[PDB]
Structure 1
Amino acid sequence: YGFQPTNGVGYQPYRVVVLSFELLHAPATVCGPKKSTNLVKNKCVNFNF
């Protein structure tokens, strides 16, 4: 590619990243993040720790 700054769009360089999630057969690995809220006290509550 001889890229030049005065090229019409569709001839200018684009950078590409391809993420490929794979799942072999291990025990686990990376994943989304977790969000912890406020922890009350002295009230019947429904909790997850």
Structure 2
Amino acid sequence: PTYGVGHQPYRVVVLSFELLHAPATVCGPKKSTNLVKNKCVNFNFNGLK
């Protein structure tokens, strides 16, 4: 503890993710709405928008 600035312990957590190569096992917080057919609409399918 004396060596304050120099060698005080830092904890580092690193997370890695792969981008939309397949169905996403993990997802962020976002709501889902009913789909519409035969309509010119914006779509955001599992991150593919």
Unaligned runs of 5+ in 2: none
**TM-score in terms of structure 1 length:** 0.45
CA RMSD of aligned residues (A): 6.0
Structure 1: runs of 5 or more not aligned:
none
> How many residues end up aligned between the 2 structures?
45
Scaled by the length of structure 2, the TM-score of the pair is 0.45
Q: Which has the higher strand share?
A: 2
Structure of greater Rg:
1
Query: As a proportion of its length, which structure holds more helix?
Result: 2
Identity of aligned residues (%): 96
RCO comparison, higher one (Cα < 8 Å, 6+): 2
